[PDB]
Structure formats: structure tokens, C-alpha cells
Design a protein around this nucleic acid. Sequence first.
RNA 1: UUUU
Lengths: 56, 358, 316, 53, 198, 466, 422
Amino acid sequence: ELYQSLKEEDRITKLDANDIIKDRFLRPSNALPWSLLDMVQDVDYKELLKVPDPIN
Amino acid sequence: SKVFIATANAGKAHDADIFSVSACNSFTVSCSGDGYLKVWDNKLLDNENPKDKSYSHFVHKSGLHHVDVLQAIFELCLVATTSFSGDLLFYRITRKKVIFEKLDLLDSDMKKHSFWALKWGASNSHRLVATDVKGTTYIWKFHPFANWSPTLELQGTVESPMSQFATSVDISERGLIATGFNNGTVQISELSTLRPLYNFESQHSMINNSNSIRSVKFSPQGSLLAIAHDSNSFGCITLYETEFGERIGSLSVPTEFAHSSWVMSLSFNDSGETLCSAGWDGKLRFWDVKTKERITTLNMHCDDIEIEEDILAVDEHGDSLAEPGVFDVKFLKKGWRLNESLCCVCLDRSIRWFREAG
Amino acid sequence: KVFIATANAGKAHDADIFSVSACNSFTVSCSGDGYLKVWDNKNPKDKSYSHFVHKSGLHHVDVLQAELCLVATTSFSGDLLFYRIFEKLDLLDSDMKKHSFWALKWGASHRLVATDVKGTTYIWKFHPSPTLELQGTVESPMTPSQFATSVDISERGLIATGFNNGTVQISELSTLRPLYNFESNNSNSIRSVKFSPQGSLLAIAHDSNSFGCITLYETEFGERIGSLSVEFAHSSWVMSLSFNDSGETLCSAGWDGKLRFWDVKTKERITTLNMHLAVDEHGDSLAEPGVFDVKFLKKGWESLCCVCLDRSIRWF
Amino acid sequence: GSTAQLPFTPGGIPSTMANATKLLHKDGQGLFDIPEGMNRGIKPMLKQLNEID
Amino acid sequence: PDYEKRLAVLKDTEFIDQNHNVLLKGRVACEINSGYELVLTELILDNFLGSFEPEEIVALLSVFVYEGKTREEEPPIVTPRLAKGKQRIEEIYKKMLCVFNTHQIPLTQDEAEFLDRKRFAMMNVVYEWARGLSFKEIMEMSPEAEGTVVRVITWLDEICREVKTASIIIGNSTLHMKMSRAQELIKRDIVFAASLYL
Amino acid sequence: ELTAFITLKEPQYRDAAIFAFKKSIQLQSNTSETWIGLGIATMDINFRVSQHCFIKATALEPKATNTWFNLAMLGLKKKDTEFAQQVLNKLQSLAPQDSSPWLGMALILEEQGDIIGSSKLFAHSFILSNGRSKAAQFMYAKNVLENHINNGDDERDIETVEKLTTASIALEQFFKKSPDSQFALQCALLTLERLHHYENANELANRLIGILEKKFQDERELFNFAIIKGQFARIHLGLGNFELSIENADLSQGIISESKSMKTKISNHICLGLSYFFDFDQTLNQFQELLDSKHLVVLIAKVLYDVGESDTKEIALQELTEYIATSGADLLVTLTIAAMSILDDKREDLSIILEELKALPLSKQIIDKHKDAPYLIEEITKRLYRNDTGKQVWQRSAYFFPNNLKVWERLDKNIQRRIASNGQNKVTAEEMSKLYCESKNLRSIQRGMFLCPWNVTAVKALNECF
Amino acid sequence: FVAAHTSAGKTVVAEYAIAMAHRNMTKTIYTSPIKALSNQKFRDFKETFDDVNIGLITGDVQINPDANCLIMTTEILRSMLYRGADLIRDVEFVIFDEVHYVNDQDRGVVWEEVIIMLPQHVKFILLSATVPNTYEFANWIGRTKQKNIYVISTPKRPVPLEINIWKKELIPVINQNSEFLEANFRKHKEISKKTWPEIVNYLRKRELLPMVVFVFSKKRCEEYADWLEGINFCNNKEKSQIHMFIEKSITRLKKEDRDLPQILKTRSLLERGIAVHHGGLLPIVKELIEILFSKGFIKVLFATETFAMGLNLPTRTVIFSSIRKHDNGLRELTPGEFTQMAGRAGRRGLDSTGTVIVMAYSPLSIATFKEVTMGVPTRLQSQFRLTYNMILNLLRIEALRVEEMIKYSFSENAKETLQPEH
RNA sequence: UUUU
């Protein structure tokens, strides 16, 4: 909608509350932070060897 | 691929930021935000000022940020550029002054789209690719003759996998297209079929939305793909293998990151053995593809300009330009300008050329 | 050694009084309301005057006297203004006026030293038709750069700059070359740096995690000689330091409302003056926020001046 | 090159199995029990006939 | 006889064992191709340098590449940690010299007169070059000529490479990162300018 | 036959390997690899014969370092730590570039009880491996996960995020070779859920759930299934599929309703409440009433306030005040109370909130890196008095913490632009483009739009330029 | 093994070896103990050869790694040999240059260890100045490596030399047949700020320029150079050419680098035909001066010993301001050093004879003069030394005993009584 | 007070 407007000297541009508080302090999220994750998360010797290679 | 020597220089080349650069055998072309298109002759002499051999043309009042050049043997030389308003503009270069001929190659319904990126695909018919602000890629075939009578034929479009901003595009010599998006996703599709092949996401984490693809490049052999992307105020490079679509590794240096601020552009040399990246921190770094290890580093200063009157130490606001960020970088084939060459454009409105020792 | 309250003036400024300075004739004080007030040294509210400088407020001030009397101040807009006591001068060039300045100090040819927000220190030379001419500049020792919070200049030709990361750099004035480099959620910001009037001694008001520390270094060798403690000198941040004419006692002002006097030779405390260490359980001072700046006055004007959070200026 | 590589043999400068294990401490029942350069074996907490040279 | 005495010295300081097998210290010292393998190995073997900065490490390592023959008086050290490193290197060399003279090994002119010459007189110059100062200030503060400074920094590059390899052997990642960072920090400008023959 | 026996773990291949090795040794006893193979073959039956074979192999070919590692691992198999340590010291002196000795040393140190040295050795082994060892990748990922579960970290720490990313990459490379590994899949899910990579977590969790479903009748199987289902419900909740999250949480809760179990119960309650909130408010209210740490209380208060009922708001306020009166005073709870009071427009408590906010100790001001207290103080001052005395707290904050960005975001924009440049502060491309566009210049607006063409303000400013 | 005077044509042998190895499709390695000659040799070989690739290997830089002829120093080759580099697989010839060069305080002259550690398929081409000790070293190499070495020694000189002595007079003391003259020496025995203007004026009148003055002091070189104010040697065209060359050459530097005091002073002297060459200069300045001297724009040069070993020094005259040089104290010049420095005073095809002048500020004794000028050449010495690094590396490589390597080193009067298990 |  703005690029359509763009389709039609260092000039200077002519471009000049409760929502911010609600979004910054009282908006719950479905992505759990690391604090809740810390609150809820719970955390053969022959396979270390090398078998020798074939011989031709 | 270890020693680079400065060759020629030009300060205060444009009146605004130089956003892109491209080169061919005959000349080097650059664009800027003032709206002009400049041509720099590659075949120079000793102790000749590059501003003496330069030709400028006014294109758009809004400014330009992308450019590409096509040269093929009747000799045709085409330039395509994108403006800040969103237009796609084609010009024909003819020579010993330089003549700019505006070409009207797009129909009326194709002039309502806002384009961002573009790239030429040379014959090995020539092809043109472009990205849209809506997340679409367009494929064209260029026919010069029917006698000179150029036409652009639309082949098809590729939609976005998810829509997001399409920021970068590339085309390989084996017939592949890579598109980068602003969330860190890269899509690879087939040229002859217009069907997507691979779709891999390169994000370190999704906690914050500061991931974005800035550049995608294909290896000269076409079997490798390099990706430059953001990581919340850092710059990262990841290498992928295009035949089967698997992650190879990453390029990093102590400063898990390739650059300190942001990686703007990438470039391969002729053999595809060395990769160069340009950073917002004001550095050029060169990497070995096989060993994934850094080779060399170049530093950019405002005092590199040969003529002392063209040195721009500060901008219009007083901020220092002692170590300016690099916008774009390009490798030049042997014989264009003995050995390979390199060009880059910076924040101090300068364009610089380098030579490889050997 | 004891001190007796002499004069007081409450509600001096409308906003926080951030800095104080004095000379043989006047005492000046800046605030965030954009006023600077000149207080006669000979109630003091009836001997006071006010002038308007900038609407963004002021946070630094200094006085130079030599019949010359000059005042320099810095605003929250990054400006740097001069006044001939009130007659505004124009000494800064057009391109130099584009910079952002934080702190200053009159080095009594006369010298002026100022710091920037990018970590750069500027040194000038005042020539009374008054003009300034830039002697040189000193860049940030570290990369990436940091905020240059404090600066001082000594009579023997030394310059000390403190940064917000805890680094103090000593540089010469003759050649502008570096000499020393000390590197002493946590905070370590360098709040104040001072040179002893006589001898070779540098006092640095260091910062701990919500604690105030003072550390003493000696010049010509760059060796740490110890720290003052009562190793924390105050239960809150230490805001400013001050020496006397002799240089034997050092006064420190803290954010706990106390003025502690120390002995340079013995590195021991002398007396404490409360404007109105105990730590409750975390590091919180039991006392209330106190003093912004302190300044010794030599004999004939010994006395001292104090500016507090209560918007009052006190003389002792 | 690297220190992980061995040099090629210089020019001009100058019963193998039986001579190799001549100084190995053979314990009871005829079996090696101490590696070379060490002084102890593992302490938990037909093969002898194979002397075919 | 010289070979036997050097074997005795190498066994005494626990570089090789009684069977003439190379130990960890000898394995690390195999990488250092400069003139002082033993002292450098003893310096970088423990966690002494764990609180240093890359600039401080590259400044301290200049004692091993600077001949120390100068007439101008040494200025005060620019950093306390540089003084601490100076003291540590001096005590290591004193101990090693006593061990050497126990076995009556003949010493070269440089090895015997190490602590007599002012070999710590380029730490400030290398420090300020690594911080980011230009060559003009460096020359205005240096006690030598341009060629000597260029040579010292050029050799310090290879010293950094060797210390990187030794740190990979030892198992110290932080030292490896610091040495790579210092190598990138000091390699710039006219000191490492490309040759006019290339 | 030895390779087949190692992969499949069946006795009949070990005997065939022993037969072949004995016949080859009879035909020619001069070769070392035959003795190596014979030592590996009998490594579980008789350790004395294996040690003899390894020693003979060393004697025949002394420039081979795999015999020493085999002997050290055999010593570790029979629990002889000092013998293995001595052999590994020799091996490190012999082949430093190899990664096996570092892995063995790290295993010994981890068994002994050391934590820092074990982590350092695991990291060195992983870096030296260069993607050639599965064991190195698995051990490194497990160590990184074990060090960063209950360590009290924040998302703003770059090093922890980079460690988690490296562990995730290592686990992907590991899965390319050995999929269907239960422990590696669990570790991968734990890392991915913490990096917010939910699609990969969905795929891996589907694979793991299939594996556990095929593998099952016991008791511990049911408990592990319940824990996996709880994590899988968390993944759906984070992915936007609320119905599936509710179903999985209910299924997991059913099997562990009469019992490590407390963590699963808390997770199920949180997931059910948040799934129901996004819109049956009654079920969400009941589940949140079913439920310290200062974070559960804040989340519950936020949800109950956003419900929109008077009883819910009163309950949230009462719970926050109860926490304040019980566990002391903190910054987040006071900020939440202040925001709720400001939104509800209660005049009586506003003055007390303003006084408490202005009487903050210096420690809380050091902790507050976003400068929320000055913001709330100015908002309350402006609402109560309709004056302009609220910028004084901003001036004091800029005095105390002059390198912050949020303090200069209000006073002087040039200061904020200069402070954020050249790496003095860490800033993203969106914020930098906004700073550039706030210069009102055409060049700056073009640069800011180049840095972020999907920014509405940059496009609007460029359009307004003309 | 070739031992001949410098500029007698020893580079023809090296070029023929390179071409012969190229014909067989094998490789050649050229090594020297001076790190400042690698770049000069690289440029010279790249100019000389066509269809043959030339590469350069140093501590950091690598240029054309997969070339036919690689140029390095002996320390690089020794490191490669100890680390088992795969480059040596295809190498057929290894060229050792400046074998006679001896310097105690230089840890880079290690060519006997290189010879000991080379494989069986590699042949050698050793080049040196004329020495009386050739057969012992050739015999040791032949015995140790079991290769057939041939000894070529030549005293013939393409251009003869004369030795003269300078009060406002030039008295020839040694003619072109190396016959000391005593009548002229006695006649000399009978008979500052103005010395060098007078010397330069006399030489310019006699047309014996360009000249090189050998000064064994870094500060005295510059003092004498500054004592030449008022004299000029160039016209407008040559000055413009020199200015353009310097401007193009210093393009690679920053603006603050181009403004350094040495660069300004060097340009000021260079635009008049004067220059100074010593070890206290920046490397780029030394390269600029050497290239401009090679091109032929410089008539007067003051140089220390660092210029004697240089590659291209075509000079008509050589002047010795003294005979004593500090090394541990002031010491008279050895006959070998004097011969090496004075052998550069001739040009093939452009000169008929070589002029060498010794400066007498009171006369000079005859004993020391004859010892310095006509003396027995210095013998070839062994620089092999035992180091802890070599011992540790050989103990790490458990295949070669250190005692055996020690016993196969060169030693004058070695015991020929070794029966190994005989 | 040459040379590295």
C-alpha cells in the first residue's frame, strides 16, 4: 500500500500510551521463557575403538 | 590469493551512498542514491585518474540501489537497474564516448510491480531474474533479434515458500535459482522446470526476529552455495552443498561469527577456491573454501584516497568516517583490468580497485 | 578537626543540582532546570542571581578567575557554553559545535579540557578579544570505544580520563602521549578522578557493585599504593572527591548522605559528617540518598560547599 | 607439512619378531604382563602355543 | 660430550625421562623454532597468562625477539601486568641459567647476557602498535629506528603462530583465541605492506 | 566378522572372528593388525589375553597409537583408573592431534568428580574431532546441556545461546549417522525447545514417540512416556496448536495423577492454562487456581488480568501483594502492580506507587537495564499532575548510566545515534535503521530503508520526502 | 660445486638447471640464507623465463604454490624437511646460494643439516665465492650423500680492477695485474665537511659516476648525504619521471603513511640523484631505492654492508671511507670482505676497467693495507650446531639416532678409525 | 657501535 504510493538536493522529509503499557507489561505469550523452562525441564567401551582396515 | 595491492581509487564519486557495483570486460558500472548511473572504463593507462575516464547518466529522482551488466558477442552491452520507487529500467551501452539508450522491454501489466533485486544469466538464451516486495521471483528470456529488435519473454514465476520480503537472488550456470528472504529462509528451484528443490533455514535461534539473508552466491563450479545472514548485530556465513542440500559448515573468527557488525556482500574468484566478504565494520576478509579458514584481511580507511581533496573524513552530521563500512564487493576476471582483480564501494562515497600479487 | 555549619539555602533550584564550583568572589551552581546561580561569598538567598542557558538542563560547571572571571558549562544536549561574568561568548568553531561534550575542567597559558560521548578528550588553550585554539586530541584507548565520564588536569602537566568500564588512562599535556593504563549485573564506572595539589598522587573514585571505593595511585611510576576503607569507603556510590590547599586531607561525598574525611599520609579516616557502614542484607545502604558534589574553599573566601538531593546548598 | 608427518628417509645415512620381544617381561603361564616403559599391568576391581615364528 | 651434557640437562628439568622419551614439555618445545624453547615452554605451560589481554601477551613476547642493545633509559611500564610478566620471565631465566651452569654447558654470548641487556625495552611500543596507534606516534615514542621496529613486529608474527600451535598441543583454547586475535591485530599498515617486487 | 559382531552384538560372530584371526596368525605371525584384531575380539572374555595381544601388537608396530588407546580403554573397562591415566598421558605425549586421548581423560575426570576440567577436555576433544567422531559430539552436547539447565541464565547472554546452537548442530550431524537413539533425541528436544526451534522439535518428538510406543509392559516406561508427552504438549503450545497441546497435556496428566513428577505436573498445569486462555476463560481460571520463583506469580497475574473480570483482577492483585508481603520486595512485581494500577486508574494508590517507585534502591536501578521505572514514573506524574516534571528522572538516569540507549532515547536523539554506532553498543538492523531515519535527511532515510526495506516508517519517510 | 667471483656468470648454471628440470617435468628449489634476496630473485627469474612458472614461499605469503621453480630461504626448507612436506616428492635439483656467507649472530644459516636430511633422489648445485677450502667440503658431501660432486673453481674476472688512494690527488697503487706498487705508495707517504663535495666534483669531471660509498655507520651515512647540499644530477624530465615513479609506488599506503619523515626526506634526496641505503630504513624505502638505482637514476649512494650482498649493483666506482669495522670492538676488514665489496666495481660491456678508491684523511700503514687488500681468502667454516629443538625433534622421530647424525657432520681432522661392528 |  505504501510501495504503490512510491510508484507514483538532500531534501527534508515532512513526517512528524495505554497500548504500550499493555503490550510491554501485561501481554502473556505462548513461548515459555528460560525461567519457566528451568522450573519445569528435567535432564559401550567397544564402540570407542577403531577396527583395522582391510589389506590388499 | 594472499596478497592484494591497491591499484586505482576515486573519492566523492557520487552525491549519496553507493549501494551496488557491477563489472564486465569493458567497464565498471555503479549506482547511487542521487539517481545517477556511472561508467568507469576498465582499460586504463598508467597514472591516469579514473574520474577522467568516466561517463554519467541520470536515471531516476528517487535513487538506485541495484545494477547488473550483460556483455556477449554484433556486440551487445546491457545494463539493468532498480530504483527506490520500484521500477525496472534497462539501458543499452554503445561506444569514443558512451551512449545510453533507454529500452522499453516490460509491458503495461509488468510495470505495476515493485522490484528489489535482479541478476543476469548469460548463455553458456540469456535470462533475467528478479524479486518482488511480495516475495515472488520472475524468470525472463532475452531475445536480441527477431536486425536489432529486443524482446523480453516471461517464462514463469516462483511463489514464496511461506509471504515474506525477498531480498536476494542468484542463478547458476547449471540451471539453479536461489532466493533469500528476510526471516533467514533460502529456497532453491530448478530453472528448466520452475519447481522448487530444497528449502533450508539458517538461523542460530528464533528467540528474536533479527535474522535476515543479505546475500546468496553460487560457486563458479555451481556445486556450492554461500549465504550471508544476520545474527542480532553479528554477521555470519554458512556453506551448503547444492547437489543434495546439506550443511557443510560455517566461516568464523574470534572478534562463531565471520564479521563484527554485518556481512553485506559475497564473491567467489574464478576457480571458486577463495571467497571474499564485505562487512559493515569496514573490513574485507578472504576465506579458503576447502579448509574453511580465514586467509587474509583488508582494512578500509577514509585516508586511502590518492587525491587529498576528495577525502571525506566526516559526513553532513559530523559522524566520523575513519573506518567506513563496505556496501558491495566484486571479483574481476583475468585480463579485464595478468592476474585477477577486485573492486568495492564504501560509505565515504569512494570506489576502490585492487590487484592480486603473482 | 571539626566543621561547623555556617549558612544554608533550601529550595535553591527547581530541579536537581548536579555540580557546584566556587572562586575567590562567587559560588556557582548548575541544575537540570537550565539555570546557573551565582552566590555571593561575602541569608545567601538575598545575594543570589539567576540566568537561563538551555532548556535541556546543565550537568557540569567550572569557574576560572585570574580582573577575569569566566564560566563554562555543559548541557544535556551536548552543548558547551561560556559566559563572562552575564555576557555569552562564541569561542567554538562551527564544525566543533557539532560534537557532543560531557565533562570539562578549567586548567588554570590557561587550559581547557573536555570529553565527548565517544570517548575522545579535547585540549584547548585560552587566549584573552578572546579566542580558543585546539592544542590536540586524545582518542579512546580501547576498541570499541566507551563513554568518557571524568577528566582532570594537574598543575605539573598530566591529564587523567576515566571511562564507564572502569579504565583510567593517564596522558601527558606536553606531547599528548599516553603514560599509564589502569583497569580496576555489575557496575565499575569511574565517577571521579583527582590530582593532589602538591606532590605526586592520584585519587580515583572507583565503583563496585552498588558500593563506593577509593583507590590511590602514585605518578612517575604508576604503582598502586592502597585504598581507603571504613574495602569500601562508602555504603553507596562515591560521587566526588576534593583535596584541600595543603593536600593532606581528602574529602569524599557519597550517595549515602555522608562526608568522610581521610588522611593522605596514614591512609586513615578522620571524621564523618552526616547531611541528614550499615548494610541491611543485600548491599543497600541504611541511609538516604545524599550528596551530588563537594568542593573545598581555601582560606579567605578553610571552608567547603555541598549540594544535596534535598535541593539545598550548604556551607560549612 | 605438519609435525604429525614423518620425514622421508635421508640418503646415504645408515627373527625380527623374536628380536622385538626379547626384553618384554613374560609372566607365569607364558604371557606378557607389563607394557614397555611402564611398571604395572591391569588389576581388576592355546594362546601360549602361538609362538609360531 | 656436549650431547651427553644436554641429555642430562633435558632430563633434569623434566623435558625427557630416564629412558630418553619425549614428555609433554618436550613435545611442546618441539614446535618453538626460535632460540629460547625452554623458557617459552615454562612460561606458557601453566595458567599464568590466563588474565592477560592479547595486546599484553604480544607485547610481553617481544623480549624473545629483541636483542636488547640500546642506550636510552627505559621508561616506566605502561601496564602492571607487563611488570608482573617481566618479573616472572626473569625468575624463570635465573632458574634455568642455574640449572645450565650446574652441568657446565658452554653458553653463547646471547644466552649468558640475557638479563644484562635491556631486553624489555620494546613492550610499550608493541603495546601501542597493537592498540591501534599509527606509525607516527610509535616512532615518536620508540627507542630504536624504523627498521628495528618493523623487524621485531615481523618476527612477533611467527612467534604468535608457534604459540598458537603449542596451545593447540597443550589444550588451552583461550590462549589459542588470544593469539589468533593478536595476530590479526598487529598485521596491518606499512609494517606489513606488500613488496615492490610483487 | 569383527565389524558385524560390534554392530549387531551377537556371540556367533565373535567366534568366527577368533577362528579367522587364529588361522591368519598361524599362516603369518609377523603382522600387527592381526594381533590388534585378536585383542579386540577377546576383550570381553579374558582381559589377560587381550592385554598380551595388545602388547605384542605394540612390539611389532610401535608407531601405531591405536594399540595404546585400546589398552587404556581395556584398563577402564575393568575399573583401573590410574593405569588408564598413565597410558593416556603417554598417548597424549605421542599423538596430541588425535581426539581420543582427550575424550578418555574427560571421561576419567567426569567419573572422579571434577566439572570444569571435564568440560574443558570435552570441548577440546570435540573441536579436535572435526566431525569425525559420534562419541565426541554426543558427549559435548550432553555436557553443554548438563551445565545450562538450572544455572540461572537469561536469553540476553550471547555465549550460552551460541553454546546451545553448537550443541544442536552437533546433534544433527550425530543423527545423520546414528538415528533412533533415545538419549540423543531427548537431549535434542531439550535444546530445541530452549532455542525456540519448534518444527525440528516436532519432527524429532514424533520420531521419539514412535520409538517409545513400539518399545512398549513395565512402570518406568509409562513414566518416561508421560514426561515425553508433557514436553510434546509444550512443543504444541509453543507452536500454536492449542487443541493438540491440551490433548497431550491431559493424556500425560492422566498417567501421573497419583505420584520429577512435580515438574511434569507444573508443566501440564501451565500448558493447559495457556492453551485454554488463547478462548475459554473458565477452564483457564480453574487451572490457574489449581497452581514462589517470582515468575509463575507474574504470569498468572498477567493472564488473570487479561481475562477481564473484576474477581480475576482482584485475585491477581491479592496474589501479587501476598508475594510482596511474604518473599520481600523486587522490581518485576512492583512494575506489574504499577502498570495494573495505571491502567485501572485508581487515584488513591497511585501516589503511594509513585513514592515507592521514586524511593528505589540503587541495586534495583542497576538491575533495570531497560529503564521501565523512569517510564512508569513519568507516566504516573503526567497523569496525576498534568505538568512536565517527569523528565527529571530521565535526566538523573542519564547522569547515572550515560552509556545506556533508553535514557538518551528521550533526551537527545543525536546522542542516541552516536552511542549506538561503531560497536559502542550492540544494536540490531531494525533499531539502527530507525535511528538513521530519525535524522530527517534524504541520505539517512535512504540508508535506513536500504538496511531494512520492510520497515513501514522508513518507506513512509521516503515517500514524504518527495 | 661452483666457486667463482661475483658477476662472472654463476646464474647461467642455475638457469640451465631450471630449464633442464623443466624439460624432464620435475621441479627445482632455489634457496638463500638472506631473506632480502628472495624477492629480487623472484622478480629476476619471472622476467628471465617464459613458459616456466616461478613461485615464492615465505613465512606467511605463498605465491604460485604449484609452480616449477620455488624460491625460499634455507630455514623454510629445513622446516619442510623435518615436517615431511609432499613438495619434495617431485624436486630434482636444490640450489644452494651464498654458501660462503658466515654470520655468528644469525640463526638462519643452516645448510649442512639440510644436506644431511635430504632424500636420495635429490641432486645439488652449490654456488659460492672463491675459497681455498673447497675440496674438503665437496669431499664430505660426496662421502655422506654418496653422490658424484664435481669441483669448478675460476679466478678469472670479466672486468679487471684497479686500487687507488685519494689530498686532492689519485695515486694508483695496484694495477690490473694485481701487482702492488711501492713507488706510488711511498709518493703517497710523502704528500670533514668539504671532503665529499670535492670527491664528487673530481669524479664528475673525470666521468666515473655512478659511485657507491661504503660507510660502516648508520648515522654517518645520513650526515655525509646531508653534507652534499647544492649539488644536482638531474634535469626536468628525469625529475618528473622519478616523481611519477615514487607517487605510483606509494599508492598502496595511507595518507598518514605517505607523510612519514623518512619518505619526505628520501623523496627530497632522490629527486636530486642521491640516496642512502642501510638497515635503519623502512623496507619499502629500501626497495624503492634499489629499484631506482637499477633503473639508473641515482649517481651517489651511501651504503653499509647490507648492500654488498645485493643482486643488481652496477657501479663504475667503489669508495672505502675506512678499513676498520665494528663487529665486539673495532676490527680491520678481512681480505674476503674487501674482495666481495670491491668486486662490484665493474660493468660488462659498459666499462673498460674497475675503479676502487680508499680514502686517507695522515697516511696509512703498509702492513695493514697489504693484509686487507692482498690477503689469503677466508676459509670455509662449519656452522653446524646442536640445539634443544633438534635433539627433541630427533627423539620424537624415533627412526634416526642423534648420535649417528652427530657423527656425520663436518669436522677438520676427523678420526678415520670407525669400524661399525667390524 | 656494522649485520640479523
